[PDB]
Homo-oligomer: A and B are copies of this chain.
Amino acid sequence: CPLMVKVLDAVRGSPAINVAVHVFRKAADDTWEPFASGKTSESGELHGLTTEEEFVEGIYKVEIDTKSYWKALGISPFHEHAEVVFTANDSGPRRYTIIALLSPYSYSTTAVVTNP
């Protein structure tokens, strides 16, 4: 599983459940092509977005729909979404975990990149 997204709610100290996540990949013509999507589970994780074979080198964008998460809790948050844009697999295949820590007016994003 080479791309995993984990989303945590820093207000409640809990996984952020049912958060929509959309992944895009930059094409040769420079547009953003839809690549995969999903929602976070009860553990705040989203697995199974892609496979080692499909996840070739390229520039990827992960957009996490944090506004709908907060709005469902009654909150009008600052960000429309939490983004992550990155070059993947430049020196060969790696496994990427994207960790997003969410608050209504702040978000932090961290990548843990490992080599199997």
Contacts and interface: CB of A to CB of B under 8 A. Distances in A.
Interface of A: 8-15, 59, 75-76, 78-87, 90, 99, 101, 103-114
A10 B86 contact: no
A103 B10 contact: yes
A13 B78 contact: yes
Report copies per complex: 4
A103 to B, nearest CB: 4
B108 A109 contact: yes
A43 to B, nearest CB: 9
Contact of A85 (B76, B81, B84, B104): B81
A59 to B, nearest CB: 6
A89 to B, nearest CB: 12
Nearest to A81: B85
A108 B112 contact: no
A107 B11 CA distance: 10
